[PDB]
Amino acid sequence: FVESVDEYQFVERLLPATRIPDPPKHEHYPTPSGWQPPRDPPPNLPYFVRRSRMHNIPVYKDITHGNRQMTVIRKVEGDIWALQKDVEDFLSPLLGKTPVTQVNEVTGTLRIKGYFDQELKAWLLEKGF
Amino acid sequence: CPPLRSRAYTPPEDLQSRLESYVKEVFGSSLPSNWQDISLEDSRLKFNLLAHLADDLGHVVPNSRLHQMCRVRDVLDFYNVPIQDRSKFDELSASNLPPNLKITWSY
Amino acid sequence: IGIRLTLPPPKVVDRWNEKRAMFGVYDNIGILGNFEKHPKELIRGPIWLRGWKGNELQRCIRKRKMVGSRMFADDLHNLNKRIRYLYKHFNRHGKFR
Amino acid sequence: ARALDLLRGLPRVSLANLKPNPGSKKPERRPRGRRRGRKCGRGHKGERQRGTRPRLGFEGGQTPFYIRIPKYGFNEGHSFRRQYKPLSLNRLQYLIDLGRVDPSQPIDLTQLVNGRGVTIQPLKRDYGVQLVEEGADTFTAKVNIEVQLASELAIAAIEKNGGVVTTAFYDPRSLDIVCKPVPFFLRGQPIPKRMLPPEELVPYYTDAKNRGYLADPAKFPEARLELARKYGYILPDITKDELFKMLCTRKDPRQIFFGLAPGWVVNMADKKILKPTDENLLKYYTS
Amino acid sequence: EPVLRKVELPVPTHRRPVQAWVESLRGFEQERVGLADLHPDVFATAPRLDILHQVAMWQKNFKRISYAKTKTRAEVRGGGRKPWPQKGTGRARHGSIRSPLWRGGGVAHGPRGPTSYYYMLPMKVRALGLKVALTVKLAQDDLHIMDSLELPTGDPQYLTELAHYRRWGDSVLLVDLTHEEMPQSIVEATSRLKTFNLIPAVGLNVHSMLKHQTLVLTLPTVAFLEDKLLWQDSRYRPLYPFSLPYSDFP
Amino acid sequence: PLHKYPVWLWKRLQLREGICSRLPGHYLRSLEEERTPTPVHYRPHGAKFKINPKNGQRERVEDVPIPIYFPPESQRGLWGGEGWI
Amino acid sequence: YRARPPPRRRPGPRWPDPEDLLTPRWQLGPRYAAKQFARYGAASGVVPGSLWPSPEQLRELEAEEREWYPSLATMQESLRVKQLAEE
Ligand SMILES: [Mg+2]
Ligand SMILES: [Mg+2]
Ligand SMILES: [Mg+2]
Ligand SMILES: [Mg+2]
Ligand SMILES: [Mg+2]
Ligand SMILES: [Mg+2]
Ligand SMILES: [Mg+2]
Ligand SMILES: [Mg+2]
C-alpha cells in the first residue's frame, strides 16, 4: 500500500533561497544586459555610492503632482557635498543652466530636478561605483 | 573592592620616549625610521601596545575612539590631550571670579 | 466655585517595577528568533481584537461574527442596534461623497 | 564617521530626547477656537451643512451621466479571460547575467519564480508566462526554456543561440502548485496530475509552429528550419553539443514536477517520498 | 592568553571594522582582557534618530488595547417616551430624557468599545532600528563586550559595586545568548536587583536599550546579532512566510 | 460578559448531566442524527455541478429545501411528508 | 530582574479532544490529520496509508473526471466535426 524511498534530489531542487546570489565571474565586461561589477580597488574619492541588493547603481526616476520629475541618488556615504558639486558640474553643460539640487545629508541622498537617470548611471559606472 | 579612581589625567613630559620604549618592546628591537608611521592594522599588537599604555598611564582609549587609532602617531596625539575631572561648581568657583559675584550650591 | 482648596496626595511612580523594566522585551521575537512567532502573538485581550485594527463599524461587524453566539441577549441586541446605526451614519451621512 | 563623533559630545540618547522627523507629523485641525469654531467648515445651513447630501453620482434630478450612457460589453466576461504575465528576453538575459536563473539546468515556471524573475497570481486568472519579442538582439544565452505562450520571433531568438523552447499548458490547480511547491508539500496531499488543455487551446498545443508539448516531434525539424530561413540564420545542430542531454529533458503532459510522478507524497520532515502500491491507485495516476 | 575576535561575515570593501575592548565580570580590575572587531554595518551605521523614534513609538503602541467604553443615548436605560408634548408648555422641546443634553444622559462622542492600536512597521525598518540603537550605544561609550556573564559569587552587591567602579551608570542591561545556558551566578545576582536586568538575545529591543544607561553584551551574542541583522539586507523578497522551509534559511 | 458555550449548544449540553445522561446510548444517537428528509415539494437538482447558459461556465449547485409547516392534526394521521407551505 | 522565558511554538503535533464540543469541525477532520503528518512527519503524525483516496472516493473521482475532463482523442474529434461544418 505504501513504500518509502530516499530519491529526494528533485524536491531539493524545488526549494528556493533567501539570500540573493553573488553574480558569477564573466569572461569580460560589460555583460549582454549591460551589467558591470564595481571597480576594485574602490575609487579614491571623498564620497562613496554603494550598490543595491541586486548589485545595481542606486539611481531612480521619481514623479510628484504628475508634472514634477526628479532623479534620486541613494546609499551615499562620506562627503555628499562633494558628490553634489560633481553632479552639478557634470549636468550643467547638458542643461545650460546649473541644475537645482536638494541635499538630504541625514538620509544620505541627492535629489535633482528632471530625469537624468541614464546619464547619471553611466557617469557613476565610469567613476567606478 | 578597590576605591573608585579619578578620571583626571595630565600627560607626562617623557611621553615621546615612553612610547618609544613600548613600541620597541612589542614590535621588536629592530625599528625602521619614522616609527610614527607604523600601522596598527595587526589586532594582537594593537591590543598589546594599548594594554601597556593603559596599565601604566591609568588612562585608557575608550571603545568609541579605538578604530581611530590606525597608526602610532594617532596614539601619541591621543595621549597628549589632558582630562580634568571636577563638578561644574568647582570649575566655576575657581574661574577668576569678580568679587561681586556669588555662587552657592544646594545639591 | 469648583476648584480644590488643598493639594492632593503626591503620587509616586515606581519606574523600576518589573513591568516597567521588561517593557517591550520580545517585540523582536520574529527577526531575532528565526520567525517562529509573529510579534502579534504577544497581544493579549479580546478574541476579535488580537492583531487587527479597524474603525468602530468594522470592530462591531467583527465582534458580531466572532463572539456573536456566545454573548448575552441584551448585549447582542445593543450590538445589532449599534451596527444598524453606524451603517446609516457612514453610508448616508457626512461632508464628502 | 563625523556624525558619530558629534554624538560623542552630545548627552545620552534616551526616551526623553526622541523627536519625529520634521514634516512627518502634521497636527490635526479641531472645530474649536474662533477660526475653525463657528460653522466649522460646513458653510451656511442647507442640505450640505446638515450632512444629508445626496449619494455620489446624483445630478440633482436629471438622468445621471453614468446611467444615461448605453451599456456595452467592455468587461462582458472579464473573469473568464486568461492572462499571461510577460517575460522579456531582456529580463531573462539579465537574470542569467546575475546568476539568478541557472543556464546549466532547464528553466520552467518553478525555476523562474524561485529566481524572482516573475510574479504569478493564479487566483488573479494568471495562466503562466508569455515569452515576448522585446530584446531579441543582445540575447546571447543557450537555455532550455518552458513557457505557456511564445511569439514566433522569441522562438527564433532562442533557437538562434542553440536553445530549445517549448510551450506547455498548466491548469490553475497545477499552476498554484508549480509556482509555490513548498506550501503544497505542507498540505499533505499527494501530487495531482496536470490536466489537459480545454477544447479551444488543444489546436494551439498540438502545433509545431508554437512548439507545443502535445505537438508531433516529427513535425519539429522542418518547422525549426523554416523559421531559420525566414529570419536568415544558420540552424545549428543540437546533437553535437555537450549539453544536449539537458536540452532534451521534457516533463510529460501529466507531470507537474521533473522527478516527481503524480500520486506520490512527500514527507518533508524526514526527507522521504512515499509511493502507493495499489493497482487501482497506480492505474488512476498513470492515466 | 589575549582574547581576539574577528568578523566572520564578509565586510564591504570601502568600510573598515570597528574595535571594542573585551572585559570579564570575574574581577573588578579585569577590564581589557581582549580586543574585538565588530561589523561596521551593524555597529557603525548612520545615526538616524528619526528611526529610533519610529521604532520606539511602534514598540510602545502596537500592543496597546483600550478598555474604555461609554454608553450612548440608545444604550442608556429608559428614555423611551416623549417627556412632554412639543407645542403645549413653555418648556424647551425634548424627545427623550436620556439625550446628551440631559443630566444622566448618554455620551455624544465617547470611547467606543475595546479599541486596538495595532500596526506593523516594515521588517527592514525594525532591523535598521536595532542597528542604529547599537551604533549609538558604542558611539557614546555606553556599550560593553564581555567574554561571559560569569560571576565570582552570586552576592548581588558585588555586581552593583562593580558597575560603580567601572562608571557604567545607574541602569545596566545584561544580554546573554540563550535563556537556558545563562550562568547560575548572574541569574542569582540579577534576580533581586531592580535596575540591572538580564535578558536573552531574542529579547533585545530598542525600548530597553534606551531605558537602560548601559548595554552589556557577550561575545557569543555579538556574533549572533551581526548574523541576523546583516541577514536582513542582502536577502530577496519572500515568496511565502519565512517560518516555512527554504533551501538555506535556518 | 460572555457565555462559555454558544447558546445554540445548550440543548446538546444539557443532555449530559441530568436524567438524559442515564438514558440508553442507542436512543441518544437516534436523537442526535440530523439526516435530511426526501424532497416532497421541490424538484431537486440532479447533479452536483451544472453549466450556466448565461456565461457557459460550470458552476456548483446546492439543494435548498422549502420549509414545511406541519399542523398538529398531522400527528394523528399519515401524510407522506406533505405539509402546509 | 530576570526576563520571563521567551515565547515558543507548541512542540510536536496537537490533537484536539473529539468529546469536547468546543473543538471546531476543522480540527476533528481528516484534512487536519494530513497536515499534521506533512508538518511533523510519520514520527508523530497519522498512519501514512490514510493519505490517499478510499476505493469509494476513487470511484467518485473517476466519475468526476469522465464527466468534466474529456480525452484528447474526443476533443480533437469534436473540433474536427465543428471545424468541418465551418467550411
Ligand atoms: Mg515616488
Ligand atoms: Mg470659522
Ligand atoms: Mg457663537
Ligand atoms: Mg437634517
Ligand atoms: Mg431606546
Ligand atoms: Mg424622537
Ligand atoms: Mg419631540
Ligand atoms: Mg451616564
HEC secondary structure over chain E: CCEEECCCCCCCCCCCCEEEEEECCCCCCCCCCEEEEECHHHHCCCCCHHHHHHHHHHHHHCCCEECCCCCCCCCCCCCCCCCCCCCCCCCCCCCCCCCCCCCCCCCCCCCCCCEECCCCCCHHHHHHHHHHHHHHHHHCCCEEEECCCCCCCCCHHHHHHHHHHCCCCCCEEEEECCCCCCCHHHHHHHHCCCCEEEEEHHHCCHHHHHHCCEEEEEHHHHHHHHHHHHHHCCECCCCCCCCCCCCCCC
G6 reaches C (C-beta below 8 A): yes
Tell me, yes or no, if G8 comes closer than 8 A to chain C by beta carbon: yes
Burial class (CB in 10 A: 0-12, 13-18, 19+), C65: exposed
Neighbour order of strands in the sheet with D149-150: D83-88, D126-132, D149-150
Cβ–Cβ gap D15/E56 under 8 Å? yes
Which of B4, B47, B62 comes nearest E141 by C-beta?
A: B62
Please return the burial class of F72, using the count of CB atoms within 10 Å of its CB with bins 0-12, 13-18 and 19+.
Answer: exposed
Question: Is the CA virtual torsion E139, E142, E147, E148 positive or negative?
Answer: negative
Per DSSP, the three-state class of B70 is: coil
Compute the residue count for chain B.
107
Nearest-CA distance from F48 to chain D in Å? 20
Question: What does the alpha-carbon distance between residue C38 and residue B81 come to, in Å, rounded to a whole number?
Answer: 51
Strand order of the β-sheet with A68-73 is A59-64, A68-73, A109-113, A101-104
| Nearest Cα residue to E56 out of E213, E207, E211 | E207
CA-CA distances (angstroms) from residue D237 to A45, D146, D163, D225?
A: 52, 20, 10, 11
Give the Å distance between the CA of E78 and the centre of ligand 5: 7
**Cα–chain-centroid distance for residue A76?**
11
Instruction: For Cα atoms A118, A121, A125, give the angle at the middle one, nearest 5 degrees.
Output: 140
Q: How far apart are alpha carbons D202 and E70 in whole angstroms? A: 66
Cross-strand pairs, D166 = D146
Ligand whose nearest atom lies closest to the CA of E79? 5
C11, C20 contact by CB (below 8 A) = no
Distance CA D28, CA E83 (A): 40
Q: Report all structural domains of chain A as residue ranges with CATH numbers, in order of start.
A: 1-129 (3.30.780.10)
Q: Judge whether A88 and A113 are in contact, CB under 8 Å.
A: no
Q: How far apart are CA C28 and CA E123, in angstroms?
A: 10
- Contact predicate D182/E245, CB 8 Å: yes
Expressed in angstroms and rounded, the spacing between residue A13 Cα and the centre of ligand 3 is 75
Cα E63–chain centre separation? 12
Q: Is the pair B, G in contact (3+ CB pairs within 8 Å)?
A: no
Angle at A16 between CA A10 and CA A22, to 5 degrees: 115
- CA of D50 from ligand 2 middle (Å) equals 16
Residue B101 near chain E (CB below 8 Å)? no
CA-CA distance, B76 to B78, in Å (whole number)?
Answer: 5
- The helix/strand/coil state of D50 is coil
Residue type, F76: R
- Residue D50: its chain C contacts at CB < 8 A? none
**Cα–Cα distance, B56 to D115 (Å, whole number):** 59
Contact between chains at A16 and D114 (C-beta distance less than 8 A): yes
B59 within 8 A of B15, measured Cβ to Cβ: no
How far is the C-alpha of G79 from the C-alpha of G84, rounded, in Å?
8
Measured between alpha carbons, how far is residue E210 from residues D22, D47, E173 in Å?
Answer: 21, 54, 10
Residues D92 and D102 sit within 8 Å (Cβ to Cβ):
no
Residue E231's closest chain A neighbor by CA?
A: A19
In A26-54, which positions are buried (b, 16+ CB within 10 angstroms) versus exposed (e)?
eeeeebbbebeebeeeeeebebbbbeeee
Cell representation of residue E115: 479599541
Looking at the complex, does the CB of residue E202 fall below 8 Å from at least one CB of chain G? yes
User: Quick one: which of A33, E231, E109, D167 has its CA closest to C85?
Assistant: E109
Residues E232 and E39: their CA atoms lie apart, in Å, by 14
CB proximity C90 to G under 8 Å:
no
Minimal Cα–Cα distance from G50 to chain C, Å? 29
d(CA E193, CA E76): 50
Q: Is E194 on the interface with G (CB under 8 A)?
A: yes
Grouping H, G, I as helix, E, B as strand and the rest as coil, residue F2 is strand
- The method of structure determination was cryo-EM
Contact B64 E4 (CB under 8 A): no
| Residue of E22, E6, E10 lying closest to E217 (CA atoms) | E22
Terminal CA-CA length for chain A? 62
CA within 13 Å, CB half, E143: 28
Is D88 an 8 Å CB contact of chain A?
no
CB–CB of E164/E236 below 8 Å? Answer: no
CA distance D276 to A5: 12
Please tell me the number of Cα atoms within 13 Å of D16 on its side-chain side.
5
Distance CA D48, CA B91 (A): 70
Q: Does A41 sit behind a cis peptide bond, omega within 30 degrees of 0 on the bond before it? A: yes
Residues E205, E199: Cα–Cα separation, whole Å = 10
C-alpha cell read off for C39: 510579534
**Ligand nearest to the CA of residue E88, numbered in listed order:** 7
Q: Under 8 Å CB-to-CB from G30, ≥6 apart: which residues?
A: G50
Nearest to D273 among A5, A20, A22 (CB): A5
**Burial of E85 by CB count in 10 Å (0-12 exposed, 13-18 middle, 19+ buried)?**
exposed
Task: Number of B to E CB contacts under 8 A, please give it.
Answer: 53
Q: Which domains does chain E have, with CATH numbers?
A: 1-250 (3.40.1370.10)
C25 contacts in E (CB within 8 Å)?
Answer: 199, 203-205, 208
Give the separation between CA E141 and CA E21, rounded to whole angstroms. 11
Q: Which of E6, E28, E140 sits opposite B1 (nearest CB)?
A: E28
Q: Which residues on adjacent β-strands are paired with residue A109?
A: A104
Q: How far apart are CA D116 and CA D93, in angstroms?
A: 14
Owner of C-alpha cell 512627518? D24
Residue that has been written with the C-alpha cell 569678580 in this structure = B98
**Residues in chain A within 8 Å Cβ distance of D98:** 21, 23, 35, 54-55
CATH architecture of the domain covering G1-87: Helix non-globular (6.10)
User: Of D146, D80, D54, which is closest to residue D107 (Cα–Cα)?
Assistant: D146
> What is the dihedral angle through the alpha carbons of E119, E125, E127, E130, rounded to the nearest 10 degrees?
-90
Q: Chain A residues with CB inside 8 Å of G48's CB?
A: 2
Touching subunits for chain B (3+ Cβ pairs under 8 A) = E
Closest CA to E197 of G6, C13, G4: G4
Long-range contacts of the stretch D119-125 (C-beta < 8 A, 24+):
D119/D85, D120/D85, D120/D175, D120/D179, D122/D172, D122/D175, D122/D176, D122/D179, D123/D176, D124/D83, D125/D79, D125/D81, D125/D82, D125/D83
H/E run at residue F60: strand F58-60
Instruction: State how far the alpha carbon of D181 is from the alpha carbons of A43, D86, D175, D197, in Å.
Output: 44, 21, 10, 21
Provide the grid cell at F55: 456565461
Residue E220 has a CB neighbour count (10 Å cut-off) of 18
User: Contact F9/G68, CB-based, under 8 Å?
Assistant: no
Resolution value in angstroms: 3.1
Q: With an 8 Å Cβ cutoff, are E46 and A17 in contact? A: no
| CB E47 within 8 Å of CB D3 | yes
Contacts G3 to E, Cβ<8 Å: 179, 197-200, 203
CA distance D207 to G72: 14
State the Cα–Cα distance between residues B45 and D12, nearest whole angstrom.
32
- The domain limits of chain G are 1-87
E211 in contact with C, Cβ within 8 Å: yes
Q: Which helix (H) or strand (E) holds D146?
A: strand D144-147
Beta bridge partners of D272: D267
Expressed as residue numbers, the domain containing C11 is: 1-96
Residue contact G2–E190, C-beta within 8 A: yes
Distance from the G30 Cα atom to the nearest Cα atom in chain A, whole angstroms:
18
Can you give the three-state secondary structure of chain A, one letter per residue?
CEEEECCCHHHHCCCCCCECCCCCCCCCCCCCCCCCCCCCCCCCCCEEECCCCCCCCCEEEEEECCCEEEEEECCEEECHHHHHHHHHHHHHHHHCCCCCEEEECCCCEEEEECCCHHHHHHHHHHHCC
Cell matching residue D249? 529533458
Report the candidate in E210, E118, E222, C36 with the shortest Cα–Cα distance to residue G6: C36
Instruction: Spell out the domain ranges in chain D.
Output: 80-287
In the structure, do chain B and chain E come into contact, i.e. share 3 or more CB pairs under 8 Å? yes
Pairing of strands D126-132, D83-88: parallel
Burial class for E45, CB neighbours closer than 10 Å (0-12, 13-18, 19+): buried
Beta-strand relationship, A59-64 and A68-73 = antiparallel
Task: Judge: C69–F4 Cβ closer than 8 Å, yes or no.
Answer: no
Which grid coordinates belong to E79?
428614555
